[PDB]
């Protein structure tokens, strides 16, 4: 036992076409977000950079470090983000 | 670990006889992906 839309094809009984995107925030580790503006990298002058979520200020001078594919970014002794992998190019930039 | 089930693989040309010699070879993460479920039992098929 149910009902049925009485959709006569002729004036104020026009329905609407709906899609609802319901959200959750406590079910698991986060799996969906939005795109982040891939602003062009700038070399040899001090800039405000944010790579892979790592935030800092410095000079992204060119480097050719041999980062392994799984190495999302790099560091050095004393826990300093000396190097980083700039994405969209798999290139390494020395901070 | 912490929801992210992490998958590691490593293929080596060791062909028996040695019976697990010194395995100084490292173990890179082939993929690190968010499943999000606790595990305490398994069985390896063949
Ligand atoms: C992603 O990587 C490809 C590699 O061919 C590159 O052409 C593209 O510019 C990169 N970024 C975007 C905008 O998808």
Short summary of the structure?
Chain A is mostly beta strands.
If you had to describe this structure to a student in words, what would you say it looks like?
This is part of a larger assembly, with two copies of chain A. Chain A is an all-beta fold and 95 residues long. Chain A has no helices and five strands. Chain A has a three-stranded antiparallel β-sheet, with no helix packed on it. In chain A, a hairpin with a 4-residue loop joins β4 and β5. Chain A is elongated, with a radius of gyration of 25 Å. Chain A binds chain B through residues 28-29, 31, 68, 70, and chain B through 2-4, 28-30, 34, 36.
List keywords for this structure.
part of a larger assembly; 2 chains; 95 residues; binds 2-acetamido-2-deoxy-beta-D-glucopyranose
Task: Present the secondary structure layout.
This is part of a larger assembly, with two copies of chain A.
Chain A: E1 47-51, E2 54-58, E3 61-63, E4 83-86, E5 91-94
Antiparallel strand pairs in A: 1-2, 3-5, 4-5
The structure holds 2-acetamido-2-deoxy-beta-D-glucopyranose.
Protein name (chain B): Spike protein S1
Organism (chain B): Severe acute respiratory syndrome coronavirus 2 (2019-nCoV)
Glycosylation sites (chain B): 38
Instruction: Label the overall shape of chain A.
Output: elongated
Quantity of strands of chain A, as a count: 5
Helix content of chain A: under 10%
Name the strands of the widest sheet of chain A in spatial order.
Answer: 3-5-4
Q: Radius of gyration of chain A, rounded?
A: 25 Å
Please give the most extensive interface between any two protein chains, plus how many residues each contributes: A-B, 5 and 8 residues
Listed once per kind, the bound small molecules are: 2-acetamido-2-deoxy-beta-D-glucopyranose
Order of helices and strands of chain A: EEEEE
PDB class: viral protein/immune system
Keywords: SARS-CoV-2, receptor binding domain, RBD, neutralizing antibody, covid-19, spike, antiviral protein, VIRAL PROTEIN-IMMUNE SYSTEM complex
Entry title: Structure of the SARS-CoV-2 S 6P trimer in complex with neutralizing antibody C032
Chains A, B: Spike glycoprotein
């Amino acid at each position: 036992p149910l009902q049925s839309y009485g959709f006569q094809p002729t004036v104020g009984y026009q329905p609407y076409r709906v899609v609802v995107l319901s959200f959750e925030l406590l079910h698991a580790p986060a799996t969906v977000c939005g795109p982040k503006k891939s602003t062009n990298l700038v070399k040899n002058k001090c800039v405000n950079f944010n790579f892979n979520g790592l935030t800092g200020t410095g000079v992204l001078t060119e480097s050719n470090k041999k980062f392994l594919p799984f190495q999302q970014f790099g560091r050095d002794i004393a826990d300093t983000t000396d190097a980083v992998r700039d994405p969209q190019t798999l290139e390494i930039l020395d901070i | 670990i912490d929801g992210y089930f992490k998958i590691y693989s490593k293929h080596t040309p060791i062909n028996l006889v040695r019976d697990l010699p010194q395995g100084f070879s490292a173990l890179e993460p082939l993929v690190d992906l968010p499943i999000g479920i606790n595990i305490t039992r398994f069985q390896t098929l063949l």
